Amino acid sequence: EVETFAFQAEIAQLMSLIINTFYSNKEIFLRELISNSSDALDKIRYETLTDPSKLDSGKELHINLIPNKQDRTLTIVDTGIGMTKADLINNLGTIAKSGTKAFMEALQAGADISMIGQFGVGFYSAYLVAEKVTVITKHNDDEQYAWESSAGGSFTVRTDTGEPMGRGTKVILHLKEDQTEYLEERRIKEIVKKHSQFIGYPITLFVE
Ligand SMILES: Oc1cc(O)c(-c2[nH]ncc2N2CCNCC2)cc1Cl
Known about the structure:
8 strands; about 25% strand; Heat shock protein HSP 90-alpha
């Protein structure tokens, strides 16, 4: 049913840093997530140039932003390449260990948390605004899985028989009580325009 894993130490330390460091410019989490979706979309596109059957699981390549004020969630959905169970456990397809080391050295040398995505671990910026993060993913080579973590040094993985998605990745941000501004249409639009203005795939902001 539900397997429980420990974060590697360097990632545990990364997440604590994200959670505990005073840092006002939290909005960058959205750019880091959209940028991950854009990379996964690039990968499926590239693979389909030589094998168009990789798109049998869906031809449209796009990103949906879905705010839900009742559940207090902001969900980012892409139809990118998705992740296998293995990628998920291996820090969501990141080089999180070396990238964390590089990020923490930069933070010495003068960097601030906004540059996180330069070290390949921009996912973890979700913890600027979310108390809990659920990642649902479907890669053509595997079943649908849900990854989940409220930080605290551990994460879980289970098969998801919730609502099949076809192919891609869904990041559900259960927002901290004081970060509900990221559910406001005006606010999301501003941020996307500010930081995600040239992404090569349509980004659709859902209405409530
Ligand atoms: O927010 C995401 C969105 C995604 O589409 C993915 C994903 N799906 N397939 C590969 C990936 N990535 C993109 C970022 N780099 C690791 C692997 C991962 C994450 Cl964490």
